[model samples]
Target: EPDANGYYYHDTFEGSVGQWTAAGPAEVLLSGRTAYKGSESLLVRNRTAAWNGAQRALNPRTFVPGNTYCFSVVASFIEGASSTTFCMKLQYVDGSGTQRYDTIDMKTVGPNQWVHLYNPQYRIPSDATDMYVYVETADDTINFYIDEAIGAVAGTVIE
Candidate 1:
């Protein structure tokens, strides 16, 4: 079960499989890779999804905006795979039934190594009152290693 703070940690190809819906004529695969810290690691591959809009995303949860949150993941690509961008986004629903998103991009520098990626500070807009967080893979066979999350809110609002 997920915790009250919504921290989820585990390693399973099946768990990474259903995190998104196919939005194009492409396929996404969840395969086994050598783990960085455990017995197994799951990798997301965009086998045929090569378009600019091709993406797969995790769902939303209550995460405060205008605060700082730290996200660290180990990721890499195939030996000659195209460079892809991964994003972490915060989604919010408005009163008019519309949804908005705020996002941050992480850098992938080293290949196949356990890289420590972090956002020491993320500025959230004042309009973002209620929000959920997501990590998205974009336009390539990007292999992402999942890890734990740590978030801190520095404001006067209550959720």
Candidate 2:
């Protein structure tokens, strides 16, 4: 469930990392790193040319027809690691009973430098449902650290 207005949901990846599923290889780093908002973050490493990373399902009732959402996350490369190509993906079933997807490509982030990735506005199609969101790498050559993933209705403030 989202906040009071049914507009915002967030995960800091702090206490327990078990909530998120790893498509290929991912883990929660509890120490030895600086988190964007809390004491831990997710790490995806050693992937090999596959869609490998972390993902979580959204509430089934979150997407209403004609509503819009903004998704965002904070990410960075591990210290001394190479730049990595990341992507944010949205998967949903449309009103026509067809599965659809949209992806936002992210710029490469260098070692130890954090960057914010945002999909400013995503309009919900009248028939869209069963939505899921994920963040993954385009390639396996680099490692990525992720924290503070968020989704909120347009015009809603994320605490």
* lDDT of each candidate versus the true structure: 0.45, 0.69
Query: What digit string (tens of lDDT, one per residue) describes model 1 on residues 53-84?
Result: 12333223434444454434444554444454
Highest-lDDT candidate: 2
Q: What TM-score, to 2 decimals, does candidate 2 have?
A: 0.77
In the range 123-159, model 2's lDDT, one tens digit per residue, is: 7666767777778766654557788787787755544
Clashes of each: 1, 1
The residue ranges of model 1 lying beyond 4 angstroms of the native Cα positions read 1-32, 46-62, 79-82, 94-97, 149-159
Q: How far off is residue 74 in model 1, in Å? A: 2.7
Candidate 1 structure lDDT:
0.45
C-alpha TM-scores of all predictions: 0.52, 0.77
**Given candidate 1, what's the lDDT at residue 96?**
66
